Design a protein around this ligand. Sequence first.
Ligand code: GQV
Lengths: 164, 164
Amino acid sequence: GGTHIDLLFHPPRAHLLTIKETIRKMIKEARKVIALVMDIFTDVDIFKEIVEASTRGVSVYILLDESNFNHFLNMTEKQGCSVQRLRNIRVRTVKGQDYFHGKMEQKFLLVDCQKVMYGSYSYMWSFEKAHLSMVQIITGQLVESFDEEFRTLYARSCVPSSFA
Amino acid sequence: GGTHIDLLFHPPRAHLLTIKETIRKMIKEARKVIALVMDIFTDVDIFKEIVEASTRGVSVYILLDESNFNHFLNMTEKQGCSVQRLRNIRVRTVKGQDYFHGKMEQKFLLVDCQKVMYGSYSYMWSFEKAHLSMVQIITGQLVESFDEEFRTLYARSCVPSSFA
Ligand SMILES: Cn1cccc(O)c1=O
């Protein structure tokens, strides 16, 4: 079996769901594992869906760019919903080489080693309302390469400073 | 015929060329058309390669995010190499919905309707030296979808203010 790819856009073009709806649906349908790599994560609806997946028992591994991590922390604080308390969620940070902060410029969502959303959509209010973006929904062989990249990234990630 | 995808990383993992080398090689080998969509374009080596392609006769269409366009203009000025003077290069800008500037969060390189580099690598010094990133090299059927998205984006692009 090979690889299948569909494209989604924001604003939508020739597909019924928005990218955000698609992200929420993928997370709702997760059975076992969610692996998320994200540059900036402030979107509350998407966060809620991930918390809720973790309460059904899904293992959630999140890797965030270190330089923007505080924005996710502020968002969890405001929602009164500390990620440290949630037993099925792990959050670690990734950084690039400094000079000026080097960043992890990577994002993707990998659900049940089965389906990947890969593209330019960051999990922020502004990608729902303001920005033009595109993603791929990937299934098949190429998903195993995203799995391997996730593990590679995870190996180079750090416990965030705040956590103890 | 279907679609073929290879992944490249920065830093490199199990491939001989860096992403920047790959970008320069794709542009050097262009025979007819380069279509580029880019959020920020300040890298001088990559610019030089595109200018040089255009002097061999390759048609170059570039679409840049409007809010960062000034960074590309500054770079061309500094290189004493005005894009308005170069007859085989067209540059237009794209923006999102404002509230706060909505942005075109899209980037990709499409050469000869034949090969696409699609991923998180922006054409800046910092992606060569500092940031972690990944791209896909795509050939086959899916390339026709990037072609169609390029034309769609081009249709919604504006002549930059500076140009007259
Ligand atoms: C991950 N990714 C993929 C394509 C384009 C992007 O700007 C990006 O961040």
